[PDB]
Design a protein around this ligand. Structure first.
Ligand code: SAH
Ligand code: SAH
Ligand code: ZN
Lengths: 58, 262, 262, 49
């Protein structure tokens, strides 16, 4: 549910511009729970996931 | 069997090339190194025959040189190539920017007589310029890995935008740790002080990995850096500290001066 | 009305990000600035409402400051925004990488109270790493605009890969000429000679624009640069003149030595 | 001609097929001999006029 939405939102500029205008509305419409929405609005990436180095000096 | 190394950019799903996406789609097998589980689900939907390179990182707090992680990655990729698989390596951002797994795989593949190439992608640096509305051309641009900057002799131009990648492990010489200490960071500050004052505004930047995520753009005096909260994805931007001095010497040879500058 | 500047990459059609293409497709109007007529066609098939910014460049042996060129570009872009059109600026490569138009148009847009953003694209730089198989993190990376490097005081780190963009107009102050002179580039050679020997191999790089086209990767001694055939899309790569040497100073502070590096 | 390049640059299946046999793939997309000759000699101008 959550993953599907994010995937689409990243690819689809229409939906992105729809999301920018009204994030809660768009999210509610895509089935996101309050906790999921709250985490989005508070930037808690940590929670969202719940619900790197490839080199050196020499 | 052949090799194509591509990038998936920073942002989920949308930031990869149209061509690169097609490479993943048509691949026999994909070896991934992606930021998170969302990016990993997207990939798996794109092509189900994925092998996740993340596994080759030290597991359960074991001491393991990252060189040995990279060697293993590279060897897994080549194993598929050698078997005769049309193989794709998908790394986050640009597959060959501050990432030695792609360059090594490509190099080794060629030497074994396999076809190998790299497709450029969008990097954390590409992301920075945009997020902080900075043109690298304005006063020019410099990049260094943070630890190499400390361990080796590098003099930055203080009129340019200076980047220190992998700041979260600045001065972690063992390559077995995921982060450094505040004492290391303090040594960095004292070193940077050769050029930049202590109150010089620096920027902790982190490009978002998700569409609903704002980027981190945390401004602070240089002195405060050692106390700052840093993450593996963190990049340190050090903005110019100095005025451009006129190259009067060269202007003369050009037979011109400031006033003639269009 | 809103603004979104995107980049189309360097290669035709396939090097644009998925999101960035979807923005062109759903725009009300598109202002293009693409390297050729093949990419301009592709664009038009994406979205037929395009105004081509090329028209604002000097036309017919006309003397015009490139500044005045960009002004009009920005202004035309803003006009569609202020009319209420969902506007997109489609520039080649990365919209904000040595690209003044977009940064100026985002700024003006935000200050007049409009929604403006920049989406990162694949730049010439990004293509150079993949084509040459060089990692900017290997020994570091610096980028400067050839003329800015010639006009003001910029100190390069001769252990890094050095780039000079717009090498083909290196020293052209007026901003009216499409190319530079031999004697301009000769003064660049003598300048560079503070850090690089005359016989230092450099690379003239040109990222392909078409999928059937190979890149230009021309290696030559620095001394022969003034007799070289340079194009507006030419970038100059100057590999390290020196190898990385240890920073005993800091290693000491870190209480370590070379042997201690992982 | 402008149609073949757009496909090729977007489509990694066509790309890989092209790199296997540039001529066979170009002929199969109806490119002329001079067009193909312009590709193989890497002359982008003559392709663009
Ligand atoms: N989201 C992000 N925001 C900022 N910097 C990031 C980042 N992801 C990676 N980096 C930088 O890149 C380093 C990892 S190396 C991988 C770089 C990646 N291939 C690219 O093209 O950017 C990090 O330590 C940091 O310096
Ligand atoms: N195809 C190409 N190959 C190599 N360098 C190129 C190039 N196109 C542009 N450049 C470089 O960029 C300069 C113009 S500045 C515009 C660059 C563009 N924003 C990008 O994404 O790269 C040129 O003078 C040259 O130095
Ligand atoms: Zn760079």
């Amino acid at each position: 549910g959550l993953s599907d939405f994010f995937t689409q939102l990243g690819q689809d500029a229409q939906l992105m511009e729809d999301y920018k205008q009204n994030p809660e509305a768009v999210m509610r419409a895509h089935g996101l729970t309050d906790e999921q929405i709250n985490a989005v609005m508070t930037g808690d990436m940590e929670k969202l996931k719940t619900l790197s180095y490839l080199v050196w000096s020499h | 069997g052949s090799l194509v190394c591509v990038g998936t950019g920073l942002q989920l799903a949308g930031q990869i090339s149209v061509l690169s996406r097609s490479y993943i789609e048509h691949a026999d097998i994909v070896f991934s190194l992606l930021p998170d589980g969302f990016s990993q689900r997207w990939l798996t939907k794109l092509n189900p025959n994925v092998i996740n390179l993340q596994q080759f990182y030290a597991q359960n707090g074991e001491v393991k040189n990252r060189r040995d992680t990279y060697e293993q990655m590279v060897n897994a990729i080549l194993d598929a190539v050698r078997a005769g698989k049309k193989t794709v390596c998908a790394l986050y951002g640009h597959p060959g920017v501050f990432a030695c797994v792609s360059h090594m795989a490509i190099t080794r593949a060629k030497a074994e007589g396999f076809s190998a190439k790299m497709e450029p992608g969008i990097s954390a640096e590409a992301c920075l310029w945009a997020d902080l509305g900075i043109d690298p051309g304005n006063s020019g641009h410099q990049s260094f890995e943070a630890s190499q900057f400390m361990f080796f002799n590098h003099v930055p131009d203080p009129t340019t935008h200076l980047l220190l990648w992998q700041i979260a492990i600045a001065g972690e010489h063992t390559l077995t740790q995921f982060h450094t200490s505040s004492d290391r960071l303090q040594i960095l500050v004292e070193q940077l002080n050769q050029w930049y004052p202590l109150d010089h505004e620096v920027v902790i930047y982190e490009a978002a990995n998700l569409p609903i995520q704002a980027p981190r753009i945390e401004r602070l005096p240089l002195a405060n850096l050692p106390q700052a909260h840093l993450m593996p994805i963190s990049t340190l931007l050090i903005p110019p500290a100095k005025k451009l001095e006129y190259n009067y010497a060269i202007l003369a040879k050009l037979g011109i001066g400031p006033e003639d500058l269009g």
